[PDB]
Amino acid sequence: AVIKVIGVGGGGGNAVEHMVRERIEGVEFFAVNTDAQALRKTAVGQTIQIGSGITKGLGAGANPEVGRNAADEDRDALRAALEGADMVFIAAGMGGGTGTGAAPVVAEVAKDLGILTVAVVTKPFNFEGKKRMAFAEQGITELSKHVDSLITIPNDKLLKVLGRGISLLDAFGAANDVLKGAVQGIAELITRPGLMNVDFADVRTVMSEMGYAMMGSGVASGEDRAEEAAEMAISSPLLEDIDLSGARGVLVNITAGFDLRLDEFETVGNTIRAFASDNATVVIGTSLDPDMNDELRVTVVATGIG
Amino acid sequence: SVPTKLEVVAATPTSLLISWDAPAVTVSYYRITYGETGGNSPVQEFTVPGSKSTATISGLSPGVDYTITVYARSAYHRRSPISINYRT
Ligand SMILES: Nc1nc2c(ncn2[C@@H]2O[C@H](COP(=O)(O)OP(=O)(O)O)[C@@H](O)[C@H]2O)c(=O)[nH]1
């Protein structure tokens, strides 16, 4: 399976280079922007410069309308780098210009080519502007028309995990990290499979044409690692606005090392099924990390949540 | 990297106490590693609660150096550790 990750925009950009520098495993990273300076600056490997004319390569003035135009120009340049993927992750901080109206355009040339298209996006912080927070909401509904799954992480929901004395530089690195965990938490099930493996087909059958989705994660250690992590994942603040008993599909990733106990897999499984509708498609698998010992990570993606 | 600082703040001949900085985001627990440098010792490691910023590493030899490295296990990231070597 060929998995392409595409950070469109200023926010999206720095997020995927955080995923290039920290490295995501068995995945190909792409930088998309209008501002040509960022492309030279960022260290990703494959930069895509859209809108070279209708922008002059001088950014989208925080203006979504030219965002959609700069990419409604180069759909064939997007398609050129896109052709052949099986799954694409589009990563953008919503609210700007480049990554607000052009991410739905990338979503559609990909979804047109029949790629499995999963958008992973931030809602801006309260302190950022009513206009950003309304720019973001409007880009998320048109993006909602050209994706199989949309994961929205409201950056405000990180204030509940961010200490005070916190610099805004830190506040956006924290959001960089959650965009990454959302992609890594799903990709690794395809690229780093474990003994209870999920095929690409099983991801597709749980993410294809499902609309809105949210995700939570949790890590624990020791005797009770499996029950503490799953609970940390179910009660995550990035999942607390949804009602997991009402999603058409739950996808669960247990990242563990070789010492994962049979009864622990059973435990995570049975606790997820206890909060999920009896009709939801529940896909529970493992991804292997041989560096992990007596710890455990549980990621949960509720898909089609309303 | 998380933590971003990790320095020895107090020392005896047979034990150190390292003190890291406080996270921008909530850590569940820290994974503290130390084993022989190259010598395939089982490393052993140990864990401390996420609320802590120091840790006592005890029963050391005023001699051989080890692989001091603090892992931050956080539900909200998977950032890479911070490290040091020390032979007392
Ligand atoms: N994760 C992340 N999000 C960001 C960053 N900078 C800005 N954002 C978010 O992204 C939104 C749009 O910013 P930006 O990407 O620069 O606009 P664009 O280039 O026109 O898409 C902001 O309202 C922020 O919430 C960043 O460095 N990392």
Residue numbers in the entry:
A (entry chain A): 11 to 316
B (entry chain B): 2 to 89
Quote the study's own text.
FtsZ polymerizes into protofilaments to form the Z-ring that acts as a scaffold for accessory proteins during cell division. FtsZ treadmilling, a motion in which the protofilament polymerizes in one end (plus-end) and depolymerizes in the other end (minus-end), drives cell wall synthesis that constricts the Z-ring to form a septum of the cell. In order to aid high-resolution structure determination of the FtsZ protofilament, we developed a monobody (Mb) that binds to both KpFtsZ and EcFtsZ with high affinity.
Two crystal forms of KpFtsZtr complexed with the Mb and two crystal forms of truncated EcFtsZ (residues 11–316; EcFtsZtr) complexed with the Mb were obtained under the same crystallization conditions. The structures of the two crystal forms (P212121 and P21) of the KpFtsZtr–Mb and EcFtsZtr–Mb complexes were determined using molecular replacement with the KpFtsZtr crystal structure (Protein Data Bank (PDB) code: 6LL528) as the reference, at resolutions of 2.20 and 2.50 (KpFtsZtr–Mb) and 1.84 and 2.60 Å (EcFtsZtr–Mb), respectively. FtsZ in the P212121 and P21 crystals of the KpFtsZtr–Mb and EcFtsZtr–Mb complexes all showed the R conformation, and the crystals contained one and three complex molecules per asymmetric unit, respectively. As the P212121 and P21 crystal structures of KpFtsZtr–Mb were very similar to those of EcFtsZtr–Mb (a root-mean-square deviation (r.m.s.d.) of 0.245 Å for 366 Cα atoms for the P212121 datasets and 0.341 Å for 340 Cα atoms for the P21 datasets; Supplementary Fig. 7a, b), we hereafter describe the crystal structures of KpFtsZtr–Mb. We used EcFtsZ as a target for this selection as EcFtsZ and KpFtsZ are highly homologous with a sequence identity of 98.7%.
